Ligand binder design. Structure first.
Ligand SMILES: N[C@@H](Cc1c[nH]c2ccccc12)C(=O)O
Ligand SMILES: N[C@@H](Cc1c[nH]c2ccccc12)C(=O)O
Lengths: 530, 531
């Protein structure tokens, strides 16, 4: 037995309690787990978005039924990120402007995988017609039935809780953290130490030996997980790991946020996250029953905090001198190495991007998954540490690049912020993808059906942003292949087979818009709200 | 404004030419003219060729050709693995395995399929923990694949009622498959078969091929040229001047001598596997078919003269050299700098080649034609289409080159100059990195799909052709072990217990299928209708 005997987790919230609950299950009670969490007040009433795998990879793994946790954190349903005013100039508005072709300036980024004909994804048949002037229809409407469901504000489940389509979650992050704290402590023997850390003790080879607390207790441990946030109190402050600032890829570094109560009865509830474009950034809208979380992500180089606060407030018609705000300074980038010696960073302590495509919870889950996969013993085999690190850096940079493309290919040039994005360089990896996409080839072609993709985290992790996602953003923003996929010009039978798939999308969207409940109605039932 | 390719000309027949022609016959939906230029071919000995499981799904099903139909026309038999005999022990070649110092025969299998997992960890890792901690005496192949038991009994991968029992692939006479596909393409896809010799490759001011001149006087116009001319690469290397990258710094064998050996099936049964029988200056393949097996001694002509190698090959099988028909081949091992250049796409040996240690030949052809259809161009030859095709071929090839190198690099044999010379070669960075991952006890190329998807969708398998299970078969088979168990297993007593159920499953499937399956021989006699 040269095994890890105690794991000490610094920090609560989602990172700390997801780590704690996950390792509780994965390590089968053979290790003592400690969470050191200073007592704390949540800033807002705010919300957070997730991706489809969360129930299966995380909550199902812990034996936690979906509705149980959803009832304890006022969770709502998400079928996409919906992008608003990303192609057109001017002051932020919650309502879409009009493109030349007469379409609203909106595009959706839904979940699921596109169907193929003759091994060619439906996207490619749509781009063919579009480039050959045989359709005016937009990509999201043509290729995803879920677009029609979201436009109608219908739910992803019928009233009888039968599944209609793919989806993920909006929730109050404070409540999920509290739910998981309760689960960890009462079902998994986690020691919750409610105290502030006052010192990190390290031996001579630079391994952490214990955390000192203000009350005087010394929490010994063998492995330490830094879930302390942007301060990186173990990984950066104690281990002295450099952070790599990546503002040369993404300009937004700040947010001003609040919870907006909302007339659900009057407006319905939107089953999607919104990205509402602003002059020096964007604003998120994350609906839950009774209120929506919202924040204006911005670059402090192009808007002062006061300018942001005023434009944020104007967008929602809020009284700026009479609203509660949470002002956040983002650290954008990742550590040079996520895991150093016996210190593993998870969450904001590890790495961070603006929540433009719901990265936060997923980054946490992926690290925890990878830490269990590469779980060490006390020798801390350097190969295990390196392979963990490679996964995390590939994960992060891939998503960083993907986000950068949202800005780089926006056709907006109306403010210095929007023009400045285009003076940045795209990383080599995403420049290559764009070149592939421009030639009409697929990018990151899905090779599995949806059951396997969302059934096995390793399949999804290997191909997180699929061809369908690259089409959602590039074609939503107006970036098109130079010409159709050339193979299509030889495949008249395949083009016909694709027309059946297009008709399938129309029909499913039609029938489900008829049969589905409103998201409002589904939530009133799920949360028993009078 | 119409820049479509209208004519495809394929130089060369054989498997490469006729698979390319039949496949594009389907893929281009009769919108292109397809021309195959092939010299009148003299019969060759069916020295036998092995395959991998995807061939029926990806290639024959795709064309609407039933498995039994082509097999009955190609003297095909069944393959459940490659089996390595005497790769760990010294001495002259023998078909019979020598005895290791632990009393086992010197054999290890490389079967198909994907290993199951418990708690997301492959069964291999549970076997390795037990092996390293003195808790099992069983070899990796016997512990983790039921197919090992089935092969040891020479049972078939199907029941007589033709229900599938396990994974498998095919042994066939390569000439008969080319003849079969030629007939198909000529009679059902209107391919123009020009039976004639090429005398000149015509090129324009851009370096693009415009036509192939033939001895009879045809000038075969084309828009796209596929080079299936073999090792001489008459289009890709000679006309297009693309250099070939010799890779003898990773694999030493460069030669083969081969023959077909009539076989007493009744007495001996038929082995449902390819054998790789280690020799002093290389190895010898055994590829069973009905009534005979194809065999070939692969060797380096630096360590064995042709005559020396022929004599050793004859002695292995008890053949009389002056009553035996031999086929002699000098390989070109490695790949072109670029597989596709301008309007010339190389396929088969004209593109790249390794010795058939893990049955790569047909697989490389199929993979290239799949990728050609996917990247099919128009007359503008978008440089990005060309480049992405080349990237897939080079990655496919170097990955396999490296896997093959590991067979030799990790052989403990030191008894001849050949076996020692392999271990003075360097491992490429990619495979070194995998070995380091493996030695830490971590998975290598973890399977992320079930077999249905993996074998149902070529692109799934192409993204992960050599999975964790394959690396274990070769590394553990040769005796390279992790430095220590996967360390996560020290914390997972419940997962270890599930894996015990998985080891039980393997034993149960092996016990019950060996009792219930028919011999390979008997299933072959039923399939082929033998008297
Ligand atoms: N792998 C993600 C891709 C995805 C699609 N739409 C998204 C919106 C937000 C974030 C991720 C996504 C998934 O299928 O779930
Ligand atoms: N992807 C191949 C890998 C493989 C396993 N065993 C083999 C033996 C020979 C050649 C390839 C293989 C398959 O599963 O079919």
């Amino acid at each position: 037995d040269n095994r890890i005997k105690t794991v000490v987790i610094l920090g609560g919230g989602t990172a700390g309690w997801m780590t704690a609950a996950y390792l509780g299950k994965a390590l089968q009670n053979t290790v003592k787990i400690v969470v050191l969490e200073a007592p704390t007040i949540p800033r807002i009433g705010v919300g957070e978005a997730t991706v489809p795998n969360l129930q299966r990879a995380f909550f199902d793994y812990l034996g936690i039924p979906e509705e149980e946790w959803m009832r304890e954190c006022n969770a709502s349903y998400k079928m996409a990120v919906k992008f608003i005013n990303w192609r057109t100039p001017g002051e932020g508005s919650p309502d879409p402007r009009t493109l030349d072709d007469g379409h609203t300036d909106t595009f959706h980024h839904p979940f699921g995988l596109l169907p193929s004909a003759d091994q060619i994804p439906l996207s490619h048949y749509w781009a063919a017609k579009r480039l050959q002037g045989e359709t005016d229809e937009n990509f999201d409407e043509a290729c995803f039935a879920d677009t029609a469901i979201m436009n109608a504000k219908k739910a992803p489940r019928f009233l009888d809780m039968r599944r209609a389509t793919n989806y993920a979650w909006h929730f109050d992050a404070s409540k999920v953290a509290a739910f998981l704290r309760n689960f960890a402590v009462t079902k998994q023997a986690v020691e919750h130490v409610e105290d502030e850390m006052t010192e990190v003790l390290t031996d001579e080879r630079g391994f952490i030996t214990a955390l000192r607390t203000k009350s005087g207790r010394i929490l010994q441990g063998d492995l330490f997980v830094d879930c302390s946030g942007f301060r990186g109190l173990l990984i950066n402050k104690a281990m002295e790991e450099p952070f790599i600032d990546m503002s040369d890829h993404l300009l937004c570094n700040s947010a001003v946020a609040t919870a907006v109560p909302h007339d659900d009865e009057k407006n319905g509830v939107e089953p999607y996250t919104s990205s509402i474009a602003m002059e020096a950034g964007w604003t998120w809208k994350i609906p839950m029953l009774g209120r929506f979380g919202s924040g204006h992500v911005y670059s402090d180089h192009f808007a002062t905090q006061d300018e942001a606060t005023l434009a944020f407030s104007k967008l929602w018609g809020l009284d700026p001198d009479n609203t509660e705000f949470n002002h956040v300074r983002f650290r954008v980038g990742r550590n040079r190495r996520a895991w150093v010696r016996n210190c593993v960073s998870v969450g904001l302590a590890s790495c961070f991007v603006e929540p433009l495509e719901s990265s936060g919870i997923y980054f946490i889950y992926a690290a925890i998954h990878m830490l269990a996969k590469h779980f060490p013993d006390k020798t801390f085999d350097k190969v295990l540490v390196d392979r963990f690190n490679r996964e995390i850096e590939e994960m992060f940079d891939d998503t960083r690049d993907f986000l950068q493309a949202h800005y780089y290919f926006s056709p907006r040039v109306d403010t210095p912020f929007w023009r400045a994005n285009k003076e940045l360089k795209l990383a080599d990896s995403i420049k290559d993808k764009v070149e592939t996409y421009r030639a009409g080839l697929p990018v990151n072609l899905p090779v599995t059906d949806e059951g396997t993709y969302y059934g096995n985290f390793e399949a999804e992790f290997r191909n997180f942003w699929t061809n369908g996602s690259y089409y959602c953003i590039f074609a939503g923003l107006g970036l098109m292949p130079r010409n159709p996929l050339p193979a299509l010009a030889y495949k008249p039978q395949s083009i016909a087979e694709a027309e059946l798939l297009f008709a399938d999308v129309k029909r499913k969207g039609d029938t489900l818009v008829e049969s589905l409940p409103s998201t409002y109605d589904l939530l009133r039932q799920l949360h028993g709200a009078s």
